[PDB]
Design a binder for this molecule. Structure first.
Ligand code: HEM
Length: 154
């Protein structure tokens, strides 16, 4: 839904590349998020001490968390927009426990795109970028709707 089936197939085709190396993509994505938008580490007390990209790359905790994040995102993307049941617990924790504003979800979406462009430049063209961007945008829109239901000013 929202995306055409053909657009979803571009998304899942790019996502298969992510699934070939989930921990590597998750490390890169979190490091890119924290390096570009260091204010986002205010949400991760446990990672505030990491002093360099090298230390971040060597952190097993950070790696495991990237796996957690991308595993959850892959399950969402594979539902192709019919992701109500996967999004419910995620919106709950991120609105009420972690308190993640929508703008931080935009930042991590931009980091996902950047990392895919860095890791797959010869197999991540304009249509694949546009489709992944639409899919992440839909994810954010539906999170925002749940945020509102929950009373959280995202
Ligand atoms: C693609 C977007 C995201 C996905 C799919 C995702 C997914 C997850 C999942 C599955 C968990 C573990 C279970 C839970 O608490 O719900 C988690 C934990 C958490 N997430 Fe997210 N997340 C995303 C974005 C973010 C962003 C952008 C931030 C902060 C800027 C953030 C902050 C946190 C924190 C603080 C935790 C707890 C970490 C800990 O255990 O120490 N999340 N996330």
């Amino acid at each position: 839904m929202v995306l055409s089936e053909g657009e979803w197939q571009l998304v899942l085709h790019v996502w298969a590349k992510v699934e070939a190396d989930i921990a590597g993509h998750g490390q890169d994505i979190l490091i890119r998020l924290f390096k570009h938008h260091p204010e986002t580490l205010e949400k991760f007390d446990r990672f505030k001490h990491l002093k360099s990209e090298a230390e971040m790359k060597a952190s097993e905790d950070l790696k495991k968390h990237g796996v957690t994040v991308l595993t959850a995102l892959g399950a969402i993307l594979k539902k192709k927009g019919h992701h109500e049941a996967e999004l419910k617990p995620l919106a709950q924790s991120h609105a009420t426990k972690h308190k993640i504003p929508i703008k931080y979800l935009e930042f991590i979406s931009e980091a996902i795109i950047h990392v895919l462009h860095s890791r797959h430049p010869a197999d991540f063209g304009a249509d694949a970028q546009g489709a992944m961007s639409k899919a992440l945008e839909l994810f954010r829109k539906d999170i925002a709707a749940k945020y509102k239901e929950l009373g959280y000013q995202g």
